[PDB]
Amino acid sequence: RAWRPIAGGPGPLVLAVDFAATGRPEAAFADLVARLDPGTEVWESLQPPLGTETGMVAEDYVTRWEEEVRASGRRIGAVLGFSAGSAFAGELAVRLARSQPRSPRLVVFDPESPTTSTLYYQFRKVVESLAGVLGEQAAREALAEGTAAADRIGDVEGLGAELVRVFTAAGRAACAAADLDDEFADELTATYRSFVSYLVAAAAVDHVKCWSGAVAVSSATPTSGLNPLDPAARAALVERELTFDVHHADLLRDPGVARAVARLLA
């Protein structure tokens, strides 16, 4: 499928868009739905089966998600997104405002439209998290290659492509050194490739159009979501911005967030 249920119901449905990654440091929609009222059904977005995202553009991702919703016959009461997922949530919400008699609520959490900086920051955190297993020297080399890449390549799709080349090459080499089992290596490199594919596709969404009716929920992490933008730019971009003094990685597990979300969905 393209959607998985993460909370049950009888009723209008809530959609939630994010990139699934078990063991990631950031709280997930599952943490948020644990902290909501139990009636309302919530579905979380699934990525294409690994590798099959190659050759898909943003339109292909959105249509895949949209058509499963159309086929269900269900009405959508709200669309949620986290981080880059906020771009796809905004496009789905705008399409559902057109396809439904009543528009869904759109709530976006640290919304991001990925740039060359966010592709590079992410690559760094990935490589740093694997240093213990790739080994510190292999990790150094990957970081320097990705750094070179970000210094040379100015567009988002091109940088994404090369970072996936660098990472794939680093995983293949760690495998050949026997520092990684060769199924662990394949899964690692396929998953990073799926992630960058998702990010680059999310960047393609017209987020200025799609976030004009969004309520944003913002952490305190300066580099996350709307925080790098100046005040006037944040106010121009979204309909309303709630702030929370919590780390980006804790946003979806915060009880104050959950309480505010329940009121926004009431």
Q: How was this structure determined?
A: X-ray
**51-63 as b/e: b if 16+ CB within 10 A:** eebeebebeebbe
Chain centroid offset of residue 188 CA: 18
Data resolution in angstroms = 1.5
CA distance 33 to 31: 6
Structure tokens given for 139: 């990790």
Tokens found for residue 160: 């994404």
Question: What is the strand order of the sheet 215-218 is part of?
Answer: 3-7, 42-45, 13-17, 76-82, 105-109, 215-218, 240-243
What are the CA-CA distances from residue 144 to residues 120, 123, 128, 148, 170 (Å)? Answer: 11, 11, 12, 6, 12
- CB within 8 Å of 16: residues ≥ 6 apart: 6, 29, 33, 42, 43, 44, 45, 79, 80, 81, 82, 85, 89
CA-based end-to-end distance of the chain: 29
Please state, in angstroms and rounded to a whole number, the distance separating the CA atoms of residues 220 and 245: 5
Orientation angle between helical segments 182-204 and 58-72, nearest 10 degrees: 90
d(CA 222, CA 185): 33
Candidates 157, 146, 153, 224; CA nearest to 196 is 157
DSSP notation for 117-181: HHHHHHHHHHHHHTHHHH-HHHHHHHHHHHHHHHHH--SHHHHHHHHHHHHHHHHHHHHHTTSS-
What contacts 24+ positions apart, CB below 8 Å, involve 233-238? 237/207, 237/208, 237/211, 237/212, 238/108, 238/111, 238/211, 238/212, 238/214
Phi then psi dihedrals of residue 229, to 5 deg: -80, 150
The DSSP symbol for 104 reads P
Q: What is the C-alpha to C-alpha distance for residues 159 and 135, in angstroms, rounded to an integer?
A: 24
Report the distance separating Cα 86 and Cα 17, nearest Å. Answer: 7
Helix axes 182-204, 116-129, angle to 10 degrees: 160
DSSP string for residues in 6-38: EE-----EEEEE----TT-SS--HHHHHTTS-S
Residue 258, both tokens: 């959950």
β-strand partners of 17: 81
Give the angle subtended at the CA of 126 by the CAs of 152 and 218, to the nearest 5°: 95
- Report which residue type is found at 126: V
